[PDB]
């Protein structure tokens, strides 16, 4: 009751209200509610890291086999210029350009690239999916994992899935 | 054929400094942890402590050693310092090919119906942070029963 | 041309105060560049291997290249370690130069800024490496160079 | 009786193998005296080792006198042959080389190790090194600057020393 800082906390209800993507030469926004109830693939990467650039071929093959999983780029670029040139050469959504070490701390991400597969209720279906997707042996078994894994509904703070996923 | 019908009909273990065998049908309907390793590889020997802590946390998962020892005597000395089950001493590169196993140790978590629950579990179980995530995977993954060729889940799991 | 301004001091904690050292102290020394962060548990567990490395190679100066998110996290790291550190800043440009893609990473650098061991973090986790590294140090001819951190981190 | 068997190892690894014209050829191991070597631990059934060949070809272009030797972990002679025909590397004869993995604690395929003429390890984890563009000038400096102190190999057999603890 004393020293209630709900007022301060409430700013976070609009955290990550948009993701970004390229269409022709436009950096466009998409309302993050679009990702409600979707499986996500979180791609931790940077345009300056050659391994992350070669990894895009594996992600593109993954996307062809798992078209309903949405790929979200979590950038570790140095400038907007680097971020924008990379995003325009991909079919991915992205977090806005920013410093995301706090997400690395939450999931103990220690390598670029890293790729994690996330269920609609923000559980981790595959922690180390970057390794998983560089051969093609994974496809049938990942389809079984997605088909068979029960999704128990959760309540996200402020009804904000990305606040839950990246902060809580 | 004939030894298709008898492929992997027993797994092996040590007890009281004696090599023993168990009907492999005992592993029907069990979660398995396939431990790819070798006694010559120091990273595999230290990994035994992570597996033992894993087993304490997940006691219904059966740990099966898939050996890459050079000699039967090295295999035996390794198996006697563990309480794991093991495939018979043999050359298992065909299993490495099937699953694209490229590192020792590797550890794969398998459901009762031979699906892969966690492909790269060695790195998962050396941390502190995996228990609740793995508990949820096991509790949430629906098991549809399967019948296996030659009535032998290891024929399916290792040879298709 | 304030390249003269670049990396004039490294930092460290001693007697619970933040101190600085002129970067010319590191001229002609073997260096161990430790890319790390206090938020990364694997970097924190790696400090024990670095301390054992330092006991066996006391003349190699370990330099911490930070990837902490905040200045307070960086200071807490310095208070708990015995390395010299770059000032708190964003060092992705060094990661790009050397294609550092993992934390921790550890690189061993000769007095004239050549790379003696590119991927030394896995090397020093064991203690199998010690004789091999002693031979590399003993046998690597040094051709002296006039300048060191602008050459090492930018070129 | 078998102190004579121990002497047999003076002829250990007397030939390496390679393919030139879909044709299997042998080369006297003495060709490799005083050479730097790149030991490539790999297997044709391992997709990561197949993709690694691209990095080894860039390495061979930039370091043509570092002789690449394939240490096989193929299941069958035919897998070994097909791999060798497509990479025209030198190779140990098809066999089981777990004892080499024990000596050097090789735990990943592919692995690649750079060896000096006196059998010291110049770069232990060279598979990681050569996947980047950046390594070339500093590896040339490392080869140019590392002093080679002469050693005596048992039976004057370099590969016996390099592979057999």
Residue numbers in the entry:
A (entry chain A): 12 to 179
B (entry chain D): 20 to 179
C (entry chain C): 21 to 167, 172 to 179
D (entry chain B): 15 to 179
The paper states:
Plasmoredoxin is a 22 ​kDa thiol–disulfide oxidoreductase involved in cellular redox regulatory processes and antioxidant defense. The structure reveals that plasmoredoxin, unique for malarial parasites, forms a new subgroup of thioredoxin-like proteins together with tryparedoxin, unique for kinetoplastids. The PfPlrx monomer (12–179 aa) contains a twisted seven-stranded, mixed β-sheet (β1, β2, β5, β4, β3, β6, β7), surrounded by five α-helices (α2 to α5). The longest helix (α2) in the PfPlrx structure comprises five turns with the typical thioredoxin active site motive WCXXC (W59, C60, K61, Y62, C63) at its N-terminal end.
We have obtained monoclinic (space group P21) and hexagonal crystals (space group P61) of PfPlrx from P. falciparum, both diffracted to 1.6 ​Å. The asymmetric unit of the monoclinic and hexagonal crystal types contained four and one monomers of PfPlrx, respectively. Finally, we combined single anomalous dispersion and molecular replacement methods to solve the monoclinic structure (Adams et al., 2010). Manually rebuilding and subsequent refinement resulted in a PfPlrx model, comprising residues 12 to 179. All structures are in the reduced form, with an equal distance (3.8 ​Å) between the Sγ-atoms of the active site cysteines (C60, C63). The four monomers (A, C, B, D) in the asymmetric unit of monoclinic crystals form two types of dimers: Dimer AC and Dimer AD (not shown). It is worth mentioning that only one (AC) of the three dimers contains cysteine residues (C60, C60′, C115, C115′) at the interface. The active site residues (W59, C60, K61), helix α4 residues (112–117), loop residues 120–123 and R89 form the dimer interface. There are four lysine residues (K61, K116, K117, K121) and one arginine residue (R89) at the interface, but they do not form polar bonds between the subunits. We have crystallized PfPlrx in its reduced form so that none of the cysteine residues at the interface, C60 and C115, and C60′ and C115′ of the adjacent subunit form a disulfide.
